[model samples]
Target chain A: DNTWIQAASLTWLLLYQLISTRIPSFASPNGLHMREQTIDSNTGQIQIDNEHRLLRWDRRPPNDIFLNGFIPRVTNQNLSPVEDTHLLNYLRTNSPSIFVSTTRARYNNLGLEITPWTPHSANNNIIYRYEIFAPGGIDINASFSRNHNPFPNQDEITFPGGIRPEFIRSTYEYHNGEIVRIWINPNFINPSTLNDVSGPSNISKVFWHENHSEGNNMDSQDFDMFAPNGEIPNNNLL
Target chain B: DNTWIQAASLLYQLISTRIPSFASPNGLHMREQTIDSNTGQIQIDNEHRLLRWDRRPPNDIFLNGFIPRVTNQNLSPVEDTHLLNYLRTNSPSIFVSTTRARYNNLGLEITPWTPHSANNNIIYRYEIFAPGGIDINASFSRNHNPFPNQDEITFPGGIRPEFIRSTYEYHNGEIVRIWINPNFINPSTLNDVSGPSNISKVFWHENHSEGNNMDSKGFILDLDYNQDFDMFAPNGEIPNNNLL
Candidate 1:
């Protein structure tokens, strides 16, 4: 039983809390921010440094942070007021059955490994703060290999036109939607190395995901993602 | 810099790791379980017990766990293969545009505060259970005042039927979805008490949330949640009615 072990940790934690003495101010919003620092040669860990807590996740310019800032949440912020109302109205009125299901898993060959004890399927990447790529939430383009500018400013994070993935046997069975928008990072970076690549050929190997896949296929750059080589879905996510 | 702190913590953690060797036999699925055990009187804390990671959040009868167990993921298991395929197919075919938004917060008046530094807005509860419940993730029905069966192990844990709620300006501006389903725990308890109430009066005061509000109306008991008394939305959440 961890009865006293829990107590031992809690005691130090209590002492630690008292020693820190946080002066509570009427301030805050900078969701969990993490940076990778090496513990040793073979392993590294992401150190979680936190600011205020208002927005879900954010990347402010260096020192400053954003709290309850703008709507339309420039960088995939929370719902705009109108959007919120529209949704409520849909529920109040006649809306299609909205089924919300949440699931999360780390990409098999994607991202960095932050937590040494993090479960096998759990995201070991230090990118848990970059909750803007992929289907559900955070997926940092932490590949140590590819040659693209993987770490872009939150606002500058843009999408790439997807290329047919190395996988997805085209039985000619599945492909693009009109406005299918998948995360562009995966397409550019090599999952094995998770290095973001800028070269057209390497990027050509990347494909957008089914996360926000909606609309019809124009047959051109708009593509559909069936089973990505690395992981699974987000949105309606956890 | 937590470099050394991380190092310090890791040092003990490393010792903790090998000292207690976890013999894995290619097994597991008990996505982070937590049980509340207080440290002292005014300060209770949860002790996290973990198992193999698989199906999101699950509550087993007790001992043995569920790893890649069933499809429909009873107790909110991961999507069925068909469901997974359907989503993938949606991308492959002509499907409606899907927009996903994720957000979280404490119920202002719900659950136990586990982390002292957990952001004022983040969930401070020990309820970060096998990842299941309310909107996008978990919302423990941890109200200390309410007098209902705040918890039940029916489906290990089940949702409560929604009530009309104590708040909501009747702009009649919003409320209800047909066949809408909300957690059963909330309606059964009192927010001030969060104590699971079996009494009709107290439960009558609780309201269902907008987390998974799909479907249409049936009027009789079907309800639409406008602005919840406590916090905000789930599903396509982080909206008002629950949060402001």
Candidate 2:
């Protein structure tokens, strides 16, 4: 029994590299190994698989959606600190498109930055965390129900978890009117024998500048991630 | 090279069974085999891990969120059909809290059903699929930011892909200010040596009733899943609802 464990570990070590270098045509439909090919590079729509539409864009000039307090703000703050070295390395390695050291642009130009997780009321201090800010507000319309109107055309969605196994998926629709569609991942992990319980992360193909043409309506759109409070039990690498 | 692949496959065959029966205590701080040991099994709640409120609720008055077009509807629809047999079996094995052949109740009662793989727009036909309807839409409020107004929080969560690894996690908060945190998982595909690309799923711990005390706001809460357009190259099984 122990022999197999060791054999499996050694296999994975070489397997990862071998697979990356020479993945068979059928190796992946869309995942890290396959490096999801950009179906619509102009719109940034990715075909994660046949089922889900992870991150998609309508090249059409987006209609006016931003109103009231949602308007873009000028953050005179010059510094966008990339805290949590582990996370920076994780993002750079896994999804290179959203590189951290970059700036935002209407089209073609892109970047993903880690800003300090400022203290706030909703979060507990024990959980050290960070924020990812990109400049885009997306209006995601989804098919929650094929029969019923998945697109309620309103801000709120009837069902948050999408298709089939209900709760396993976590989908957050846009408030007010903007609908939000999230990318479910290969939530990849590097492990020895056990699967690590690293806390749930706030990672996704950031949809910055919802409407590429619109300028007044865009700035930093951020989501956060919490690092486990106590010492990790299994792995020491962290 | 071929020998290592053959050797590893043989090992997994035995290890999966051995682990299921006597998994070490510390081996899994939280994951299957730990069986999620029902943190509040009475409420069908599970603790997938810290930093995630995957499926949680105010357990409060659930204050008047269900109004207008979202009211409960009576389905002269008895004979509640369970179409996809594969999915029916899948749900039964994974998160058993919500059972198949059960009636609706306030608290403690749960059930998950697979209706016909209905066809609908907004989704492509190449992807065959099904629907899962549970009663509860657990209101989830998270520290998307440790800062104030993680609750401007009007219906749709301010951010979707959640936390640091953005595109990796797919989260959907409800519309009418009802916050929903969802579990992410296997979406597990039965695989062979070469990896297989399965599609996204809609499997989750169905939160039947938002407010235990209230009865009016009761019925099915559903999300859909798409089966890959073609044949599966991997093992034959629907992905279980176990936490990642």
Candidate 3:
């Protein structure tokens, strides 16, 4: 009798909400940077600051920390202005989705773990960053402290030819959709003990710069950096 | 102007309910677990056992502490059962088509003086935990690790045989993939005087765990331990979208 009564009451409550539309609506829009507005509750007025209010619910309360830097401004950092703003807008409106699926797995025990027998299967937390030096080609200053240089070994690839990687070169040029040009000004060095070689093998190696010589350090005596070990792929010139 | 005014008012009140549905109904449904009951108060109800409330207009609360430990009373450990149940019942209820096109880069920027250049991109953080001796047949953990570090180096042939544990003899046949960490392992002891060879060479070398010996400590003699390398890809299967 008690079970039936409890079930009946639960059913009634559920039905009441469903029928009365007391069930909060779950319909949502999609896309990354969806824009929501900030409103003045007392004035019942809408404020348009060219920014979306995706981080707040019911106009942020006084104690909310996000209110500190809440100046409205146009954002175009990740996506280009011409590209569809759906993803960004969606993310803006639904900022919390950024942490949802992950939070579920975390609490439900389907979270991340490093299992034995399958040490290789464990997932790694990776942090990645990208920068584009264009139009006004940005300058990068790479300095190697003498103390931080790795000890030379049998497999170490060194600067000028085999020394530094192309990605770490100080200056790079990307022009008119042609080949991306890299300047390996002699001082590049490979800080890894894995590949035992010396000098910058090619002009496009992105890793290390050797010798610290300041000019066009490209020379044949620079050793066939790519010959013994094959050329690195940098500008589709594999 | 009157029509516009009415439209704006309607939009304002409906905004909260509408925005969530737009981003992800499924995500919002999952959030429902954090909402509270009748009084609209956000409080932890252990008898119901939820990470957040399971109601609408989320209770504006976060679960206070870690989930309690569960003993196995049924097919699954008690906690797993509760979590799985909550997900199953609510996950599909809020199911909506994932608008992949919705993820746009919204002017993400890093300051000029920031030391690491990589910190400028979008980052997703995740964490997972499991009790000792869970079944090892899961999709993610079964195929990715146990190879040489490949964070920077990829095999031209798709199969790397020159790096650590690249042979089937290392994994005893149970494993099938390996990644080589080229920049992690050192060839010598703490001797830092060697010019270039002193850097670490970590590689990803994947293969079946056959002919390898497992020690009494339940660890593989060669490659079975908690070792992190720079090249480990967290994205499953997909190479390009591996980071997000």
Top-TM-score structure, candidate number: 1
Docking class of 3: incorrect
State the TM-score for model 1.
Answer: 0.18
Q: Which residue runs does candidate 1 get wrong by more than 4 Å? A: A1-238, B1-33, B36-188, B191-243
Candidate that would win on DockQ = 1
Q: What's model 1's overall lDDT? A: 0.18
What RMSD, rounded to one decimal, does every model reach? Answer: 24.5, 24.7, 28.8
Better of 2 and 3 by TM-score: 2
* Candidate 1 chain A weakest ten by summed lDDT: A221-230
**TM-score per model for chain B alone?**
0.22, 0.16, 0.15
Tens-digit lDDT string for candidate 1 (A77-193): 242323322211221121221111111222223332221111111222111111211111111122111111111112111111111122111110012111112223343212442
Clashes of 3: 139
**DockQ for each of the predicted structures, in order?**
0.02, 0.01, 0.01
Q: List model 3 lDDT by residue over B1-244, tens digit each.
A: 1111110103222222432332233221111222234553322222211111011110100111111112121112221222122111111111110000111144222111111212222111101110111111121122233221111111111111111111111122122222122221221311221112333322222221222233232233322121111112221111232111
TM-score of chain A of each: 0.17, 0.18, 0.14
lDDT of each: 0.18, 0.18, 0.18
**Which parts of model 3 are misplaced by more than 4 Å?**
A1-199, A202-238, B1-19, B26-173, B176-234, B238-244
**Candidate 2 CAPRI grade:** incorrect
Count clashes in each candidate, considering only residues at least 3 apart in sequence or on different chains: 53, 52, 139
* Distance from true location, Cα of B23 in model 1, Å: 23
